[PDB]
């Protein structure tokens, strides 16, 4: 089973989902707004790709931390912020079944799944 994680109104959410509905990839949605997320997941994810790549430290929620909060991080801290705050989990997560896609590159979803 196919999983993308993030959220329905995203423009890279609606992009990806139009690539892979078009490629007639059966996939499941885990939508962040209607289930969250765990640790578990964000472990995972880091562990293959790094924190900087799952964080979305370009975004507006991370922006909009404090101070304190964005101070000497690393994987375990990066986890429990978007444990906390989804939002700042860059979009889309892709699990193809041994690894994962971060981001929607059309050529690494063609070299995954076409």
Same mark, same amino acid.
């Given at each position: 089973?196919?999983?993308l994680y993030g959220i329905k109104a995203c423009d890279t959410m609606k992009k990806?989902?139009?690539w892979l509905?078009?490629?007639?990839?059966?996939?499941?949605?885990?939508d962040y707004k209607a289930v *969250?997320?765990?640790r578990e997941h964000l472990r995972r994810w880091c562990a293959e790709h *790094?924190?900087?790549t799952v964080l979305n430290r370009a975004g507006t929620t991370f922006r909009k931390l404090d101070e304190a909060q964005k101070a000497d991080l690393d994987?375990?801290?990066a986890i429990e912020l978007m444990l906390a705050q989804p939002?700042?989990?860059?979009?889309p997560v892709l699990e193809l079944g *041994?690894?994962?896609?971060?981001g929607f590159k059309p050529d690494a979803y063609a070299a995954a799944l076409a």
């Open positions: 089973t196919y999983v990806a989902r139009t509905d078009e490629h007639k990839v059966a996939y499941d949605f885990h *969250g997320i765990d *790094g924190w900087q994987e375990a801290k939002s700042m989990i860059k979009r *041994g690894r994962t896609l971060v």
